[PDB]
Amino acid sequence: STGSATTTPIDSLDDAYITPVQIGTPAQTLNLDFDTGSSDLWVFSSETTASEVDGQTIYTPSKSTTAKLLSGATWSISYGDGSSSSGDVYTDTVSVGGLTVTGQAVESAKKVSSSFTEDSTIDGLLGLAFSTLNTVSPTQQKTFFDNAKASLDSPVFTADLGYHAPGTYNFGFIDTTAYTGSITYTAVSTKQGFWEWTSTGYAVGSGTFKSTSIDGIADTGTTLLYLPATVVSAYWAQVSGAKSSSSVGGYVFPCSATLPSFTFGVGSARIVIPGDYIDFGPISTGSSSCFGGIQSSAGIGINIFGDVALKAAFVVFNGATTPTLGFASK
């Protein structure tokens, strides 16, 4: 089997991407944030504290003939940005782009943090990291990909995120028309439950490439590119007027600037992120200070190849017995 679904930016800045997902019988379609950095499929629901729902589409298990309460099971998760949600668990039929999993754990939110309430465009998350990170207790549950894997034509999914444009998540096949040149594959460590890999270095603009190992995660659920402070300083040094602002929470730059590209290594191959992809616009409405898309990972504890990086590439998440990651230009 295979599945193919379009993923759409939630706003003009590509702050996140949403992908329609069918849950239950008859289908209830929710727009979920596919997140390769976590492993819970959770949704706004009829059980979510009413004051914490503001425009989201909710899953109502009592209206689904295939929903079954997973007795005794609860979940609770916190994300890198300090957001969180928690609740109880149903199993139900879940389809993405024509690919159906029966008995998928669908984590129903009783509580969500303010950041989720305030984003009317995201109805939940669909985790695509390794199932070892799944938070369901006392019986850990499998991700949608982990459940679908054995039925797929090939045990893979691909992320093809657009810059200010829709893109695609494919399950079970590699669309050879969706990228240029060849896909370069690179080793993955699953020890922390992430799609963790080691970039071979970087370049800033037309500068010379610096060979250096940068260990990080491929995370579709993180907006920006978070890299070591040395690397980030070298980037922003090439933008007149750019500075790290403690008050704003990272590097900012004059909105009148033309940003240089940033290149990252994947083995001997190179992925080029155009300068425009690094512009996240005014820090507040009407400001001439703009927020940068490349930021320091110093305060995080891990480097994160988020959407800014991934949208520059066609990315293969290969879930074979020994997982790997593949990157191609497009």
Ligand SMILES: O=C(N1CCC[C@@H](O)C1)C1(c2ccccc2)CC1
């Ligand atoms: O809605 C979110 N956004 C991310 C920040 C920019 C916003 O436009 C979108 C939040 C989120 C999404 C996915 C994972 C963790 C947190 C904070 C709730």
